[PDB]
Design an enzyme around this catalytic site. Structure first.
Site, PDB file in Angstrom:
ATOM      1  N   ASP A   1     -35.968 -48.888 -13.056  1.00  0.00           N
ATOM      2  CA  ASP A   1     -34.737 -48.708 -12.244  1.00  0.00           C
ATOM      3  C   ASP A   1     -34.562 -49.832 -11.210  1.00  0.00           C
ATOM      4  OD1 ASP A   1     -37.048 -47.829 -10.898  1.00  0.00           O
ATOM      5  OD2 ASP A   1     -35.921 -46.448  -9.596  1.00  0.00           O
TER       6      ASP A   1
ATOM      7  N   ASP B   1     -39.731 -53.371  -9.612  1.00  0.00           N
ATOM      8  CA  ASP B   1     -39.413 -53.287 -11.023  1.00  0.00           C
ATOM      9  C   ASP B   1     -39.171 -54.687 -11.547  1.00  0.00           C
ATOM     10  OD1 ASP B   1     -38.505 -50.143 -11.574  1.00  0.00           O
ATOM     11  OD2 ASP B   1     -37.984 -50.876  -9.527  1.00  0.00           O
TER      12      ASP B   1
ATOM     13  N   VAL C   1     -41.592 -46.592 -14.703  1.00  0.00           N
ATOM     14  CA  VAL C   1     -41.787 -46.984 -13.333  1.00  0.00           C
ATOM     15  C   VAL C   1     -40.568 -46.682 -12.450  1.00  0.00           C
ATOM     16  CG1 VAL C   1     -43.468 -48.739 -14.079  1.00  0.00           C
ATOM     17  CG2 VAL C   1     -41.124 -49.522 -13.561  1.00  0.00           C
TER      18      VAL C   1
ATOM     19  N   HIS D   1     -45.429 -51.754  -6.288  1.00  0.00           N
ATOM     20  CA  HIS D   1     -45.975 -50.609  -6.959  1.00  0.00           C
ATOM     21  C   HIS D   1     -46.047 -50.781  -8.476  1.00  0.00           C
ATOM     22  CE1 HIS D   1     -45.436 -48.444  -3.086  1.00  0.00           C
ATOM     23  NE2 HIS D   1     -44.298 -49.115  -3.010  1.00  0.00           N
ATOM     24  N   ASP D   2     -44.888 -51.072  -9.063  1.00  0.00           N
ATOM     25  CA  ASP D   2     -44.666 -50.982 -10.509  1.00  0.00           C
ATOM     26  C   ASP D   2     -45.407 -52.023 -11.328  1.00  0.00           C
ATOM     27  OD1 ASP D   2     -43.011 -48.920  -9.747  1.00  0.00           O
ATOM     28  OD2 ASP D   2     -41.160 -50.121 -10.011  1.00  0.00           O
TER      29      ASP D   2
HETATM   30  O1  LIG Z   1     -38.647 -48.414   0.659  1.00  0.00           O
HETATM   31  C1  LIG Z   1     -38.407 -47.906  -0.452  1.00  0.00           C
HETATM   32  N1  LIG Z   1     -37.430 -46.992  -0.570  1.00  0.00           N
HETATM   33  C2  LIG Z   1     -37.150 -46.405  -1.761  1.00  0.00           C
HETATM   34  N2  LIG Z   1     -37.792 -46.685  -2.921  1.00  0.00           N
HETATM   35  C3  LIG Z   1     -38.796 -47.597  -2.936  1.00  0.00           C
HETATM   36  C4  LIG Z   1     -39.178 -48.278  -1.678  1.00  0.00           C
HETATM   37  N3  LIG Z   1     -40.188 -49.120  -1.986  1.00  0.00           N
HETATM   38  C5  LIG Z   1     -40.424 -48.985  -3.317  1.00  0.00           C
HETATM   39  N4  LIG Z   1     -39.591 -48.077  -3.881  1.00  0.00           N
HETATM   40  C6  LIG Z   1     -39.534 -47.665  -5.305  1.00  0.00           C
HETATM   41  O2  LIG Z   1     -40.075 -46.354  -5.476  1.00  0.00           O
HETATM   42  C7  LIG Z   1     -41.245 -46.343  -6.326  1.00  0.00           C
HETATM   43  C8  LIG Z   1     -42.483 -45.781  -5.634  1.00  0.00           C
HETATM   44  O3  LIG Z   1     -42.180 -45.384  -4.287  1.00  0.00           O
HETATM   45  C9  LIG Z   1     -41.486 -47.775  -6.777  1.00  0.00           C
HETATM   46  O4  LIG Z   1     -41.523 -47.857  -8.213  1.00  0.00           O
HETATM   47  C10 LIG Z   1     -40.374 -48.612  -6.142  1.00  0.00           C
HETATM   48  O5  LIG Z   1     -39.551 -49.263  -7.112  1.00  0.00           O
HETATM   49 CA   LIG Z   2     -39.045 -48.498  -9.573  1.00  0.00          CA
END
Ligand SMILES: O=c1[nH]cnc2c1ncn2[C@@H]1O[C@H](CO)[C@@H](O)[C@H]1O
Ligand SMILES: [Ca+2]
Ligand SMILES: O=c1[nH]cnc2c1ncn2[C@@H]1O[C@H](CO)[C@@H](O)[C@H]1O
Ligand SMILES: O=c1[nH]cnc2c1ncn2[C@@H]1O[C@H](CO)[C@@H](O)[C@H]1O
Ligand SMILES: O=c1[nH]cnc2c1ncn2[C@@H]1O[C@H](CO)[C@@H](O)[C@H]1O
Ligand SMILES: [Ca+2]
Ligand SMILES: [Ca+2]
Ligand SMILES: [Ca+2]
Lengths: 283, 307, 309, 303
Positions: free
Chosen positions: A9, A14, A116, A213-214
């Site tokens: 997404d 990502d 992811v 993360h991903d």
């Molecule tokens: O600050 C943020 N706000 C919202 N979504 C996030 C932020 N940082 C990363 N992710 C997204 O949420 C997933 C895990 O939390 C990750 O895969 C990332 O794409």
């Molecule tokens: Ca993501």
């Protein structure tokens, strides 16, 4: 070579995951499926297309679920930073869910799914055609937290965004690997990590410049030995209330239920950032 | 003429609904989508194909969801095949290749917004299409569904089978904002098909009268031992009846909410009869049906099949 | 001197907490109220009385709730044995429970007070929730509640829940929504206080009736806390509350918004602690983070030695 | 004679229940316990005292739980508008209601029936505080729940909705239960012609009945569309005087304590589809001729 379908997404991290998966010789990236999450599907789809166009990645992109299976939608252009030319490629015609089903059914059972974002595409496919289940070699997902979540004290964004979808995946009986916040929060990307990538340069180093993360899911497939995991019985909480979308992980084994997930504990950040640079370089 | 897509899990009363919808000049039956429910999808699909073949109905049949969107599957009452009683010649009829969920989406998207959806099994196909393509929502003129109960359920004290089989799907449908009409157990239990009603359709005869007898003679033993109703209600057919002539059915507008809590009210449709919550109504809920009008309507359709 | 009412379900570490609270000059132990938990109330009451008789503690003991406010009862025979306090020998009881019910005692004592009494619950919260609801006027009269219960990380009894909360979540939900100042010594902190063979041998060396009781007591749970959770010794969870009152500087706490989950299902009796403040709700609890085990074991020994004759 | 403890939150129909129980020779009213509900306990207590004083009922009154066992409190303006009461010349006992219930049951020969007609806070606190009272309770005849539509919410009747957790304790206690739900009690609507009948019988109880039932006449109609305030709580007294005026059906009943649309629902298994043994006799139908006759009979005992 590990054959993968990357469901995502985009999304800043990502985008890094797409960058790594498309380039590493140990990954055979069959295609990218897009799900609403970080932003609405119209936006995530465009971000995903832009990443592939900029990096000249030649991989089919498919649009999937614009909404979670049951709950009221939530979000995080969803990829502010890099500047993109006008878009000259589009989604395939085939819906992402159908693509996932057909590709798995036609396959020899060796494709790994790598979700992811929220799990809407994965849950819809699994329930739409249950026969894909023994076809999936493994699911390596970014989501959940055995400790504190991010979006809520209890829940990580991808699970919180579609808990019911998450419940389907966790009760599927397919081999699961979960890279949760307990692991991925260790991969913080500080100014000198960015500067290192800038120095490697090229189109991927510049995009990286404009926690991660991903990308750890790709990392894990390239080389599982950089990541320590522990097998656990995991259950997804779908109660409305303070724990909606929690992944409840049985660290100590007190329920006496057989493990259903390999849960990420620690990551070697030296090995990992080396791997990121290695991929940035391939461009 | 009301254009409809009939979504069903045949199923004894589903077969009656198929029979009515396909024949009446006031209904334009665009196609039939099948969902797992009464039995597994492999079986409901065959039962659906068998009904249409036997009655020589020329309407495309599409297979849909073989499972609910989240919960553990359950089946129904209707027996081993899920449509016991009639005897069918070998099936030469086949399902369309297009998946039911895609069919629903494309048909609605291409449409001018006047197709009504008529779900009379669990709501899996409907919920998947609504979430897969949210833009179909203003395209749906109305949803006339068989499901729920403002009083007592059947499968549990709280829940009617169709909702109970996929509560999450139901929650999607009831929060969609699309005009809904709900033919619940409170209404449909009034349509008990006693031996004299069967005898009446036998007398009209032809292929649809014989099928009505064969099918409804089976759910004579099986709806009594379970619920103690005077015979098999013909739940699903009341949706077609409602479209043919809404004046034979009294409805009341209510705020309706689907309970997805695990526990004693899982899959309950909570209907605000008295308006105590101060929320705007989202559903027209079935209260009473004129059984004289209705059985007359059933006979009228049965007779459209005399060759 | 901090005036306290100690509410407990003894219980191996409860007995250590009774030993410490009764002896330290910085604690004024007004009374001990007993709740079912570790074992049924008939058993936890006797264990409570035996501890005070053995150690010649002259403090009124009161029996409270034999059952949680709503849920089906559970015990911890697995951790604490058949008696609820397997280990030490006790002579026949020559003392008994006060006639006043624990819940009434808590209410009257708080009402009569000047608002400076601290409640120290270290079993399920049945007695505390019943008093709070029975007489809401006690609420401003409670200076603070320092409780042993919950876990911001992994529970013990279930992956989600620590035993004291799990055993009466509804009672817990009353306490945590009371608006009274709360301090929570959860498993995240109290698991750091594992009582290994060397710690036991230390207390044996100090000797006297409290050192011997410590040894008899903590040798039992040494093995059950290892069999059940994989711990290096039986933690002394409940004694950390006394420790906190004697000197709060041995314990690091962080203020958090905390919420008890009463949903049936996988998180029934979870204390959901908002570590990072993402809910934008004002904190309602000081949550135990870390404990200085050198300070703490020194404090245990200091109390053990107050009993040498 | 059936010995009873009447637990209540007066309350217009609670007052009618007090009137009947105290007067009928087939009921031995041992004491009245008060719970918060209809209004806060300070209010329900005074209302309960005023009723007994006005009718010269000589029965000890005990104040109990001012709050539900877990949830945020809700009420249903003094809680009993209509009648005019003199200044109070009696007071509540000093023993708390919960302690009273426990000691009286423990001291008994197991022959006392409990009659709760407000939220179940006093009952659940006693049951859990002293589990040994359980086999001592001959029966519980309660006003509460609904197998169909509730009143306070589509799912829930007020008494249960006001303390679901307390309700869950009562329904899982294993004590013989009789439940007079809204499905039954909504049949006992008190229309202007029923009021005028009691006015005609006259005396202090006939006048009180009139002053009381006139108020609820308006507020039952605006809220629930009913033809005149039903007299819910009095049906429990009716059931004890003569169970043959009321048809019951045995059912497995479960209380829903989920937060959400069915919080405080009594889920009654009408058709026995769960295959669980019944735990409750559920009120189905009431003979309103028998019943109103019985109300009048009691009203008359006060002349
Ligand atoms: O600050 C943020 N706000 C919202 N979504 C996030 C932020 N940082 C990363 N992710 C997204 O949420 C997933 C895990 O939390 C990750 O895969 C990332 O794409
Ligand atoms: Ca993501
Ligand atoms: O006895 C039954 N149990 C379960 N499902 C049933 C029964 N009778 C009919 N149906 C199927 O489920 C809906 C009725 O609630 C109807 O759509 C019918 O097709
Ligand atoms: O490991 C355990 N599991 C369950 N209960 C325990 C354990 N250790 C002590 N206790 C008892 O429960 C509370 C702390 O969880 C303590 O108050 C203690 O008395
Ligand atoms: O209109 C009303 N709304 C709410 N509660 C009521 C009403 N009338 C009486 N009661 C009180 O609530 C219980 C049953 O609903 C009865 O015990 C009654 O005293
Ligand atoms: Ca059907
Ligand atoms: Ca304890
Ligand atoms: Ca009342």
């Amino acid at each position: 070579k590990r054959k993968i379908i990357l469901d995502c997404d985009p999304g800043h991290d990502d985008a890094i995951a797409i960058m790594m998966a498309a380039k590493h010789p140990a990954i055979d990236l069959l295609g990218i499926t897009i799900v609403a999450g970080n932003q609405t599907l119209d936006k995530t789809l465009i971000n995903g297309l832009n990443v592939c166009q900029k990096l000249e990645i030649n991989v089919p992109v498919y649009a999937g679920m614009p909404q979670p299976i049951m709950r009221q939608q939530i979000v995080a252009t969803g990829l502010d930073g890099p500047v993109f030319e006008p878009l000259t490629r589009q989604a395939e015609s085939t819906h992402a869910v159908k693509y996932i089903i057909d590709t798995l059914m036609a396959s020899d059972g060796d494709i790994t799914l790598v979700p992811v974002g929220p799990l809407s595409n994965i849950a819809v496919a699994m329930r739409m055609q249950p026969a894909i289940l023994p076809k999936i070699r493994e699911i390596v997902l970014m989501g959940g937290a055995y400790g504190t979540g991010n979006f809520t004290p209890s829940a990580e964004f991808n699970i919180f965004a579609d808990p019911e979808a998450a419940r389907v995946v966790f009760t599927s009986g397919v081999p699961l690997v979960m890279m949760g916040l307990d692991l991925t929060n260790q991969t913080v990307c500080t100014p000198d990590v960015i500067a290192r990538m800038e120095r490697a340069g090229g189109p991927a180093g510049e995009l990286f410049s404009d926690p991660v993360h991903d990308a750890t899911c790709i990392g894990y497939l390239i080389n599982p030995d950089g990541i320590k995991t522990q097998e656990m019985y995991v259950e997804v909480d779908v109660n409305s209330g303070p724990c909606y979308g929690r992944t409840v992980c049985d660290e100590l084994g007190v329920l006496g239920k057989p493990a259903n997930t390999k849960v990420g504990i620690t990551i070697d950040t030296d090995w990992f950032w080396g791997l990121v640079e290695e991929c940035v370089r391939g461009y």
